[PDB]
């Protein structure tokens, strides 16, 4: 029953009680490495909602990432083309900031499999996220068919391919009309919609 009070307060981020908690927490995160082990989920109602269990083989890692735009990596703003491709600064990186935060942990703890992630804090410079890991090599996850799926070799680096909640959102994977151009994948639609079909007895 504890999580129900954890759930509701944790949404009251702009109250004087969490603004003290928020302000203090961000300082110690900024006092540690850009990406590191977190001792435990600071938001147990959030981690366990996202598939986390307090069992031997679930791993916690906090991440921080730089914020703002993506400046186009051209020397001296030299694009060498038409006026419409002359922008260098206002470029926004179609992939999300937690999506780029999961990849660095997956690179870091490569023998792990990322489950999901969530925001913990932020400042002007660093956006902060906790990332929930899981170890297919650990016997406490190999069994328990609740969590044996993550052990299948088709689930390596789920975030880099974009199979987490971050990617499926960035990739625009949702049902209905507002997702026509990317419903089963934007490229696969384009290739299917831009292929000409011919039969033996041509129609």
């Amino acid at each position: 029953g504890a999580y129900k009070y954890l759930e509701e307060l944790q949404r009251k981020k702009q109250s004087d009680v969490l603004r003290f908690l928020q302000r203090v927490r961000v300082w110690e995160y900024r006092q540690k490495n850009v990406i590191h082990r977190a001792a435990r989920p600071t938001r147990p109602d959030k981690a366990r909602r996202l598939g986390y269990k307090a069992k031997q083989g679930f791993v916690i890692y906090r991440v921080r990432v730089r914020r703002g735009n993506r400046k186009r990596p051209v020397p001296k703003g030299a694009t060498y083309g038409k006026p419409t491709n002359q922008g260098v600064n206002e470029l926004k990186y179609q992939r999300s900031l937690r999506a780029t935060a999961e990849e660095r942990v997956g690179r870091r703890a490569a023998n792990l499999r990322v489950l999901n992630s969530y925001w913990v804090n932020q400042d002007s410079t660093y956006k902060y996220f906790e990332v929930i890991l899981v170890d297919p090599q650990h016997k406490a996850i190999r069994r328990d068919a609740r969590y044996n799926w993550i052990c299948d070799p088709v689930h390596k680096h789920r975030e880099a391919r974009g199979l987490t909640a971050t990617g499926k959102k960035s990739r625009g994977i949702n049902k209905g009309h507002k997702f026509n151009n990317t419903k089963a994948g934007r490229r696969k639609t384009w290739k299917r919609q831009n292929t000409l079909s011919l039969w033996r007895y041509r129609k």
Partner: protein
């Protein structure tokens, strides 16, 4: 759940929860229901009372 069901008559609470949000409501539940509580020092001492390492409540 015990506090909500009025099934408590003295609550021991550790002051040393690293996430404080786990307990900030515990003194608040106890008064509104009417349960008396004692915020006592030490999880490691509320732990051995439970034969655990930490309990954060008793």
């Amino acid at each position: 759940a015990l506090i909500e069901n009025k099934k408590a008559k003295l609550v021991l609470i550790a002051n040393d929860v690293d996430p404080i949000e786990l307990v900030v409501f515990l003194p608040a539940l106890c008064k509104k229901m009417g349960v008396p509580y004692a915020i006592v020092k030490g999880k490691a001492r509320l732990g051995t009372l439970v034969n655990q390492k930490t309990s954060a409540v008793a």
